[PDB]
Amino acid sequence: TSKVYDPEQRKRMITGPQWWARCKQMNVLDSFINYYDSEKHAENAVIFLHGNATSSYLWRHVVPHIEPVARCIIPDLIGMGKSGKSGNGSYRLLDHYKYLTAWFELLNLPKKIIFVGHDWGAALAFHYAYEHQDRIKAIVHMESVVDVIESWDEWPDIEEDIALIKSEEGEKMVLENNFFVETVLPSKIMRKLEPEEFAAYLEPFKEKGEVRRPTLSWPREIPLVKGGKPDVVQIVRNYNAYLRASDDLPKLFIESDPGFFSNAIVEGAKKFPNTEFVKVKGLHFLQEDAPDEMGKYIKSFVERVLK
């Protein structure tokens, strides 16, 4: 698809090496986790969780708006970014959840943490929210994993493609052809990424083979009531039943306009109480189209939940 550059972005472009030089690493279980830490204002910890095909690089321009308020930590999920690989080589939802909570344990986090989850990164930010319900102060989600899927009514034309990924064909799509990196990522961004910031995303999966396994295992965890993984379906069912009862939990829903999943999940997200709704430009990876808008929005949101 044809896209054009943002004329005022190469001047403030943050390259991959420039971002990783500001990121730390730390051994977690039988591996390590590369992550970015602002450190300052450690009394409140906000955690930015990326989804599929991305890394901490997704929140490079969103985070400068919230750091002077709270300590913002952004990890690369296991097997993705500059972090290490998982021990067994499996990259399912719980395979990320275990490493992520073990890495949480090594961070000196306050009692109630604040999460910023996007795509599958929201599901984790929700699953933890279901297990450690006393350890959350706020939740900010966008293009998330809200509830299960049962219809495909107002969803993007991703059916059949989902069935293609779930079959052996997807192995050639993602492992050998890098589907979610060479096709899905630049397609669902309204602007044309500069070559450096696109190489920053291609770097973890520039090689063919099993290293691209997470980007293939992430969509295979989709919570389809018909055909989906029963364990993940039950997990999301449980934490959606919990989130619909989170009356005191202040939440923030960022809707990407026009977006990719926003139209299909904004009605299911309205069933979550104490939710403040904002909307702004972008497709799926709305952090690449309107990063400053989102930064100001969530900075104000966290300032007012701290009250």
């Binding site: 698809t1 044809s2 896209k3 054009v4 550059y5 943002d6 004329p7 107002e154 993007p156 034309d157 059949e160 493609d161 096709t183 397609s187 309204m190 602007r191 044309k192 070559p195 306009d257 026009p258 977006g259 990719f260 139209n263 430009k281 497709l283 189209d289």
Partner: protein, 228 residues
């Protein structure tokens, strides 16, 4: 025939001012084309409003019927309209209800096709392939062309190919009006178009499109003594 102040190969400069929903933007185009064979290639830039929050291919048909290969058996209403040029008003209805209005003027000065275009789109569906940017390009098309007193009416169905392999069509109706009185008006024919995008490698932020348009009648022989 340079009596109209033309050449077999002609350069063109197009300036488009567009508004899609609430996004205002300006685009430019520099191109070259054969008006006798009916081919054209234009490099397109976005001089204001970048990036575009919509699919680009909706502006491809706004970026000159002078680049049409008219046979000797069909009157070329467009080449006759020069040296003054010609204007056209274009109404587009997308298959989901979205609408577009394209008002364009085609002049000639030094010996170049100076095109000025105004583009206005409205009522696009957020899940449509234009907002979702699911469009790969344009498929070939056939445009009905017939005379209406002094105007010429063109009408076609333009089909965008989607990333998933499906197609998304829109109905386009254009009224072309010459600036000078044209000698002979055409009967009823079809212009076959193929507008494609070349140089797809990333490189800089510009879109190079090549369109081939050839006018002809139906290839089915009319049964003698039949109507119409």
């Amino acid at each position: 025939l340079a009596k109209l102040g033309l050449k077999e190969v002609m350069p063109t400069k197009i300036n488009l001012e567009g508004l899609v929903g609430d996004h205002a933007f300006s685009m430019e185009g520099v191109g070259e084309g054969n008006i006798l064979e009916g081919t054209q290639e234009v490099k397109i830039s976005v001089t204001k409003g970048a990036p575009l929050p919509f699919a680009f291919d909706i502006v491809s048909v706004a970026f000159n019927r002078a680049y049409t290969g008219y046979p000797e058996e069909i009157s070329d209403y467009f080449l006759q309209s020069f040296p003054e040029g010609f204007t056209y008003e274009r109404n587009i209805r997308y298959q989901d209800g979205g609408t577009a209005i394209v008002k364009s003027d085609i002049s000639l000065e030094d010996g170049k096709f100076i095109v000025n275009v105004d583009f206005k789109a409205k009522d696009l569906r957020r899940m449509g392939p234009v907002m979702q940017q699911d469009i790969v390009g344009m498929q070939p098309s056939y445009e009905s062309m017939y005379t209406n007193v002094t105007s010429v009416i063109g009408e076609c169905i333009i089909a965008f190919k989607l990333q998933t392999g499906k197609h998304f069509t829109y109905h386009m109706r254009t009224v072309y009006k010459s600036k000078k009185p044209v000698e002979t008006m055409p009967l009823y024919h079809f212009i076959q178009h193929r507008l494609v995008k070349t140089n797809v490698d990333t490189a800089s932020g510009y879109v190079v499109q090549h369109e081939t348009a050839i006018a002809a009648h139906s290839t089915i022989k009319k049964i003698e003594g039949s109507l119409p």
